[PDB]
From a paper:
The transpeptidase LtdMt2 catalyzes the formation of the (3–3) cross-links characteristic of the peptidoglycan layer in the [name] cell wall. The structure analysis reveals that [name] folds into three domains: two domains in the N-terminal part, both of which show an immunoglobulin-related fold, and a C-­terminal transpeptidase domain. Combining the structures of the two fragments provides a view of the complete three-domain extramembrane part of [name] and shows that the protein extends at least 80–100 Å from the plasma membrane into the peptidoglycan layer and thus defines the maximal distance at which cross-links are formed by this enzyme.
The structure of the BC module, which was determined to 1.86 Å resolution using Se-SAD phasing, consists of the B domain with an immunoglobulin-related fold and the catalytic domain belonging to the ErfK/YbiS/YbnG fold family. The crystal asymmetric unit contains two molecules with a monomer–monomer interface of approximately 800 Å2, suggesting crystal-packing contacts rather than dimer formation. The structures of the two molecules in the asymmetric unit in the crystals of the BC module are essentially identical, displaying a Cα r.m.s.d. of 0.3 Å for 259 aligned residues. Two of the acetate ions are located in the active-site cleft of domain C. Finally, each polypeptide chain contains a bound metal ion. The core of the transpeptidase domain consists of a β-­sandwich formed by two β-sheets packed together. In [name] the active site is located under a lid formed by a pair of antiparallel β-strands and their connecting loop (residues 298–324) that protrude from the core of the catalytic domain. The three tryptophan residues (Trp394, Trp398 and Trp401) in this segment form extensive stacking interactions at the domain interface and are likely to stabilize the relative orientation of the two domains.
Numbering used by the authors: 148 to 408
The structure:
């Protein structure tokens, strides 16, 4: 009996995504030969751009260029793992493909010195939103965050992130208009309870609190792969292997890869 593993490729076939979206290939088993996996994945872009592979964990590899994508780029991915030994006799269960395109450049910068989140679309300021980020004891990390999933309404529960709800930094919070920007649990979301503090004082556990209307706007206009950059906070840097932290790894290190470690 064969040992098989199924690949899953993102983003979605035909999706339009932002300039920060990486190609993601996740397998349902640990990959013992990361080099075989990389060799089996073919990527074509138009206009052509150099890119490289980097593993976030034993099951998931990412591919991106050095710089954010050029708007209008079309990308084809073929994960040709059928017939490929991905290490220790674990074979690809199937081949998978995605074709996607890059939309407008959307980069929203949150500067702790001004407490404003400024959304720029192809270089042009379209919104200036007062924000309240993580208070000093639970700060928002600096760095480049890739926009992920969005929810009209959800609960953020700190136990998802290893912090008990009953503990001083714990929370179990209903939020409207929530756009996820890290797997570590940073979201841009509606925070009617911090509208006074927004633009002046950090009060959150690390999320970018903005007004109800600004969060709904963000929910409506920003898409997976668009960019939030956080600067000047008292936090550290979002980890490169967060899940949405890919761009915080310097290109030389990204390009060198981690196929053999
Ligand atoms: Na305010």
């Amino acid at each position: 009996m064969a040992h098989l593993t199924m690949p899953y490729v993102m983003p979605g076939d035909g999706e339009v995504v932002g300039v920060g979206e990486p190609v993601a290939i996740r397998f349902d088993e640990n990959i013992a030969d990361r080099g075989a996996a990389e060799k089996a994945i073919k990527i074509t872009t138009n206009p052509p751009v150099e890119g490289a592979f980097y593993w976030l964990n034993n099951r998931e590899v990412r591919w991106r260029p050095e710089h954010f994508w050029k708007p209008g780029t079309a990308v084809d991915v073929a994960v040709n793992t059928y017939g490929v030994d991905l290490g220790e006799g674990m074979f690809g269960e199937d081949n998978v493909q995605t074709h996607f395109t890059i939309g407008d450049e959307v980069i929203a910068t949150a500067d702790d010195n001004t407490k404003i989140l400024t959304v720029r679309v192809n270089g042009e300021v379209v919104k200036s939103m007062p924000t309240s980020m993580g208070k000093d004891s639970t700060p928002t990390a600096n760095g480049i965050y890739i926009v992920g999933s969005r929810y009209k309404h959800i609960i953020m529960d700190s136990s998802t992130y290893g912090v008990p709800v009953n503990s001083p930094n714990g929370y179990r919070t209903d939020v409207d208009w929530a756009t996820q920007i890290s797997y570590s649990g940073v979201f841009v979301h509606s925070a009617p309870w911090s509208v006074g503090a927004q633009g002046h004082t950090n009060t959150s556990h690390g999320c970018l609190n903005v007004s109800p209307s600004n969060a709904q706007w963000f929910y409506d206009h920003v898409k997976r792969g668009d960019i939030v950059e956080v600067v000047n906070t008292v936090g550290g840097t979002l980890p490169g292997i967060d899940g949405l932290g890919d761009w915080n790894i310097p290109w030389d290190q990204w390009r060198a890869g981690n196929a053999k470690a």
